[PDB]
Amino acid sequence: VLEVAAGRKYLQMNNYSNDDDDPPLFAKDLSDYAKAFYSDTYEVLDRFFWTHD
Amino acid sequence: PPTASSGHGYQCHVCSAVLFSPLDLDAHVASHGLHGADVENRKTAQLLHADTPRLVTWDAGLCTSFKIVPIVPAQVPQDVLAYTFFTSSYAIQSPFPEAAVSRIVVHTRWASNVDFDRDSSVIMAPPTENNIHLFKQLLNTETLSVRGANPLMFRANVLHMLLEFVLDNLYLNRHTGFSQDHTPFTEGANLRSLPGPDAEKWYSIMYPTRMGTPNVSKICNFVASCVRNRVGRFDRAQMMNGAMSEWVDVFETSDALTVSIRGRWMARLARMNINPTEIEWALTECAQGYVTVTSPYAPSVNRLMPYRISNAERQISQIIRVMNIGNNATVIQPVLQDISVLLQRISPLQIDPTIISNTMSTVSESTTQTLSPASSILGKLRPSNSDFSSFRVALAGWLYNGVVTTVIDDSSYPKDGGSVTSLENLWDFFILALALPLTTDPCAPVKAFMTLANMMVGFETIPMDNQIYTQSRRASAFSTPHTWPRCFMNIQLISPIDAPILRQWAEIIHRYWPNPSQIRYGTPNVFGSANLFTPPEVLLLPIDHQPANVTTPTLDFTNELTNWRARVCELMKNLVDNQRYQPGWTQSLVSSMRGTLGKLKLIKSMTPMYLQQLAPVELAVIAPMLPFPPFQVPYVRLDRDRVPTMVGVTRQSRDTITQPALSLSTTNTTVGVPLALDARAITVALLSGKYPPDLVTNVWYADAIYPMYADTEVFSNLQRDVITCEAVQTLVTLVAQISETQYPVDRYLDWIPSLRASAATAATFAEWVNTSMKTAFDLSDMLLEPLLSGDPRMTQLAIQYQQYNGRTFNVIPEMPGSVIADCVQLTAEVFNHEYNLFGIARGDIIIGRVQSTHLWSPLAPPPDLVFDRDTPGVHIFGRDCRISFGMNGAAPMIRDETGMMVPFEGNWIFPLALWQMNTRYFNQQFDAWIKTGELRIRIEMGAYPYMLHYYDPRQYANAWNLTSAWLEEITPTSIPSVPFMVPISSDHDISSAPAVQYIISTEYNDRSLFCTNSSSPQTIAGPDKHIPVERYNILTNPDAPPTQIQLPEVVDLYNVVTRYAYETPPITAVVMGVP
Amino acid sequence: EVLLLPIDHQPANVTTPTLDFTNELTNWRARVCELMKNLVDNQRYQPGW
Amino acid sequence: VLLQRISPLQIDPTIISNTMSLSPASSILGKLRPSNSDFS
Ligand SMILES: [Zn+2]
Structure with a gap:
């Protein structure tokens, strides 16, 4: 079960200051927002997530 | 100091x-x-180490509990048979008591040569003596008489007696040794030799069918009808050459009851058995490759080491442990203390607070200036390696957030305010902001935000929820989820035109606060999963963890805990920036503050890298060997809806509510205690940190982790958990017999009388059970006492926590079976049929005169002497019994239950309570009529202990002196034993003489009678009974297979028993580690 | 023939459960404890702790 | 005194201490003072 850390679909600039007309970034602009567990079979993945929170 | x-x-x-x-x-x-x-103190020592019980105990004597005692000596020298007939004349020793009347009694472990006695014993004298004291122990604390017992407690006393009878027989049948028969009595059989001083007397007791058969006496009549080839050993497993064959099967004297009990005990122990390969796999997986252990690879010798247990038992043990800990803070603190101690022993990190001094001494600042940030932080920080145990206690508190909650002390806060113009308060803010993310307190982020909010009042402003928790309120008081201000959850109320720095700090907290993670300790193959809310073998952490890539670590600034410090230093840089917040400062002071902050943000410290890479590995290597397993709940990062607001345990139902999932919401007790810490110490340890000169982590841990895994003591706690679960189940199953509980228990002894138990009665009975189970197994500490402080007859175990949403998570562990409760139920089911052997009789008695020369036995009377309810011409009494004196010659009268009044004659029916309530008024009125008149009474009792009196049939005998001293001793609280007169059996004819009986039974109670005139050819006068062949089925019935047992209605007194020669070495004698 | 009492009374038996919230006084104790719990829950009324 | 002599009820304050084991527990213990044994 390979575990890779997803990262930064987006990217923020200086003049981006939380404006009501700025585009939402959906939290995908900072370092670690989720982890990806790749495998070959969903059975193996489902068994992996028995001892994982 | x-x-x-x-x-x-x-x-x-x-x-x-x-x-x-x-x-x-x-x-x-x-x-x-x-x-x-x-x-x-007792609870603290309990948590730190319990008392391991005594599971494996061996027995070398023959496994029986029923013995045969002669009650009346035979008439060997007589004038009808010459003395040359009997075998006694020739000194031939027979397997059975050669007397005129034998009888079976109960003496647990009378032929046993044990390794370790369990102090429990049910010893009974023969029925000719008095056994009333076996039934007046538990609740009979106010019976004045010495030979008197309270009838409303026979059921409780019998239940306790059966529990003793089971606990006394929790032994293993041991393999001793054999020899061959050099005589022609058997076709060369192998005869077990049991140890002891006097061993010659056992070969005639163990083997009934070796005796010669010269006579037609009853013993020889029996022995001549048995099977020849069922004696001694008939099967064995000889796996090694001359190495004491593992187990054997032998025919010999023993009863099916104790044989079944010990079989169940061995089948329970065999389920916990683990082998060296599994042990070494588990230890290697726990230590995570740092420690290697080796097992052998050869044909074994059948070790026996019971150490494996299910997960339900560990979960129940954990629930009871938390129930003990709840709301103390001195029962839990020693655990954190010694965890910190072994963290100090194992960890390679070393806090040397000279890094701070050497980095602050290089600051460039003038001298004609009344402020100095370097000196200010050196004073506020005070680097001294006196007490950095706060760091380790914080690290150990991560394993316990369900019970312990580490919170920063309020002595670390700025002393009622603090402003941004004060350098002391700025450094205080820095110290608290670094120290807060390392605590398991869920309100740390809001406490940090409001530290800044308090510290800058009058400069910026934000709207609060009410006028109590205003912005000037002390920051350390926001310590619940309800208290978090609305402007911290809705960021657009901290408008950047008015509170720019405060909005910035809020966004920094929301985005860059540390994230939880997990490490996956332990191995639940051999051990179980003690954790209750997290999945098995997972260890939650308040910070991210990603392993290391090299074993020779070197510095890097690429981790979460360093980015947090960088962000805090950047915001403090912005804060010191403006002249709005420090109008009096100068350019030199502003530049010096910049220099100190920029030099403090990049300080060559190894502590963050350690906390990322090595600390969770050490926690996971230490966890499986802890005496008290971790008890965690999730680390919600910053969401308010999910913060846990309680965790509570239940130990009894609430109402007419049988289901724990429905009764758990309103019958729990909250658990948890906070521990204060030192932000100064934590931040000093977090800024100062360095490794040894050239450490190689694999070698370091390989030779620092060895001793704690060479020390084998966690294996002996699983047995304590087994005993805890067994005890709780036995308590439930036994209290259900005298009370009305929620479990689908079975009931066998409802025919024995008993009182209406209340809470005090149930608690007392539970205390007796607790002490009786602690006496066996050799326990000294508490066991089952956490469940006794309430109502023991509605018990149930369950735990849960609740979130701020009100959504609750509960854990109702399933109760596994218990061999001890199963064996108690088996003994009760056998008591239901074999009650006579334990001294009890069923039915009731019929007090009335019977004079005749007949020789029938009062424990088996003829049919036309008993009467019952549905008999014509019988009067039933009880509801309002009134006496009316006779006047002018007319006879007195007593009131029927239906309102009629009758004289003193005929057949009556009393409740024993009705007699007891009027024991004296009734004796004076009735005894004169029972003795010589025509009165007859059937005192209905249900169960009663009896006593026997034998008399010579050829002489006048009279029962009134016995049956009057019983009636006049019946009392509103006690009754003595019921005396019966039994005649003696005679193997030759005699002359008859009148007898006068007064008491007789209403059923057949003459079941303990074994044999009468066992040495003579016949029994001609009196109750005769040959040797009971049904008791010896596999020996008289050739078609029955050798392993058959007829359990509920016969005890069988002789059968095949299996004997073991296993060996129980310590773990370290089999699984050696490599130094 | 009447004896007034400031509480309800029921027929007697010793085999009745301790925790029985049908009983008036037990119910009163439970309700008072529940309200003091609700008072202490949020720390809305105890600043300075 | 007559009720005290004919009643089955017994009043021992040790139950509170056994169930208990600024420390609100110790606070209510000191405020109930179970060691006193006057229940007139
Ligand atoms: Zn010197």
């Missing part, structure tokens, strides 16, 4: 000098050598 010394001691004794104090003397000589009990 900064101690000094004063006065007394002076002896240098290496160079003959005299010092100023004994402490100075000690330091001086050290320089020479160097150069050149409350319940809280």
Whole structure:
């Protein structure tokens, strides 16, 4: 079960200051927002997530 | 502290000098050598280490509990048979008591040569003596008489007696040794030799069918009808060459009851058995490759080491442990203490607070200036390696957030305010902001935000929820989820035109606060999963963890805990930036503050890298060997909806509510205690940190982790958990018999009388059970006492926590079976049929005169002497019994239950309570009529202990002296044993003489009678009974297979028993580690 | 023939559960404890702790 | 006194201490003072 850390679909600039007309970034602009567990079979993945929170 | 010394001691004794104090003397000589009990104490000791019970205990004597005792001696020298007939004349020793009347009694473990006695015993004298004291132990504390017992407690006393009868027989049948029969009595059989001083007397007791058969006496009549080839050993497993064959099967005297009990006990122990390969796999997986252990690879010798248990037992044990800990803070603190101790022993990190000094001494700042940030932080921080145990206690508190909650002390806050213009308060903010993310307190982020909010009031402003928790309120008081201000959850109320720095700090907290993670400790193959809310073998952490890539670590600034410090330093840089917040400062001071902050943000410290890479590995390597397993709940990062607001345990139902999932919401007790810490100490340890010169982590841990895994003591706690679950189940199953509980228990002894138990009665009975189970198994500490402080007859175990949403998570562990409760139920089911052997009789008695020369036995009377309810001409009494005196010759009268009044004659029916309530008024009125008149009474009792009196049939005998001293001793609280008169059996004819019986039974109670005139050819006068063949089925019935048992209605007194020769070595004698 | 009492009374038996919230006084104790719990829950009324 | 002599009820304050084991627990213990044994 390979575990890779997803990262930064987006990217923020200086003049981006939380404006009501700025585009939402959906939290995908900072370092670690989720982890990806790749495998070959969903059975193996489902068994992996028995001892994982 | 900064101690000094004063006065007394002076002896240098290496160079003959005299010092100023004994402490100075000690330091001086050290320089020479160097150069050149409350319940809280009981609970604490309980958590730190319990008492392991005694599971494996061996037995070398024959496994029986029923013995045969002669009650009346035979008439060997007589004038009808010459003495040359009997075998006694020739000194032939027979397997059975050669008497005129034998009888079966109960003496647990009478032929046994044990390794370790369990102190429990059910010893019974023969029925001719008095056995009333076996039924007046538990609740019979106010019976004045010595030979008197209270009938409303027979059921409780019998239940306790059966529990003793089971606990006394929790032994293993041991394999001793054999020899061959050099005589022709058997076709060369192998005969077990049991140890002891006098062993010759056992070969005639164990083997009934070896005796010769010269006579037609009853013993020989029996022995001549048995099977020849069922004696001694008939099967064995000889796996090694001359190495004491593992187990054997032998025919010999033993009863099916104790054989079944010990079989169940061995089948329970065999389920916990683990082998060296599994042990070494589990230890290697726990230590995570740092420690290797080896097992052998050869044909074994059948070890027996019961150490494996299910997960339900560990979960129940954990629930009981938390139930003990709840709301104390002194029962849990020693655990954190010694965890920190072994963290100090194992960890390679070393906090040397000279990094801070060496980095602050290089700051460039003028001298014509009344402020100095370097000196200010050095004073606020005070780097001293005196007490950095706060860091380790914080690290250990991560394993326990369900019970313990580490919170920063309020002595670390800025003393009622603090403003941004004060350098002390700025450094206080920095210290708190670094120290807060390392605590398991869920309100740390809001406490940090409001530290800043308090610290800058009058400069910026934000709207609060009410006028109590205003912005000037002390920051350390926001300590619940309800208290978090609305402007911290809705960011657009901190508008950047008014509170720019405060909005910035809020966004920084929301985005860059540390994230939880997990490490996956342990191995639940051999051990179980003690954790209750997290999945098995997972360990939650308040910070991210990603392993290391090399074993020779070197510095890097690429981790979460360093990015947090960078962000805090950046915001403090922005804060010091403006002249709005420090109008009086100068350019030199602003530049010096910049220099100190920029030099403090990049400080070559190894502590963050350690916390990322190595600390969770050490926690996971230490966890499986802890005496008290971790008890965690999730670490919600910053969401308010999910913060846990309680965790509570239940130990009894609430109402007419049988289901724990429905009764758990309103019958729990909250658990948890906070521990204060030191932000100064935590931040000093977090800024100062360094490794040894060239450490190689694999070698370091490989030779620092060895001892704690060579120490095998966690294996002996699983047995304690087994015993805990067994005890709780036995308590439930036994209390359900005298009370009305929620479980689908079975009921066998409802025919024995008993009172209406209340809470006090149930609690007392539970205490008796607790003490009786602690006496066996050799326990000293508490066991089952956490469940006794409430109502023991509605018990149930369950735990849960609740979130701020009100969504609750509960854990109702399933109760596994218990061999001890199963065996108690089996013994009760056998008691239901074999009650006579334990001294009890069923039915009721019929008090009335019967005079005749007949020889029938009162324990088996003829049919036309008993009467019952549905008999014509019988009067039933009980509801309002009134007597009316007779006048002018007319007879007195008593009132029927239906309102009629009758004289003193005929057949009556009393409740025993009705007699007891009027024991004296009734004796004077009735006894004169029972003795010589025509009255007859059937006192209905249900169950009663009896006593026997034998008399010679050829002489006048009379029962009134026995049956009057019983009636006049019946009492509103006690009754003595019921005396019966039994005649003696005679193997030759005799002359008859009148007898006068008064008491008789209403059923057949003559079941303990074994044999009458066992040495004579016949029994001609009196109750005769040959040897019971049904008791010896596999020996008289050739078609029955050798392993058959008819359990509920016969005990069988002789059968095949299996004997083991396993060996129980310690773990370390089999699984050796490699140093 | 009447004896007034400031509480309800029921027929007697010793085999009745301790925790029985049908009982008036037990119910009163439970309700008072529940309200003091609700008072202490949020720390809305105890600043300075 | 007559009720006290004919009643089955017994009043022992040790139950509170056994169930208990600024420390609100110790606070209510000191405020109930179970060691006193006057229940007139
Ligand atoms: Zn010296």
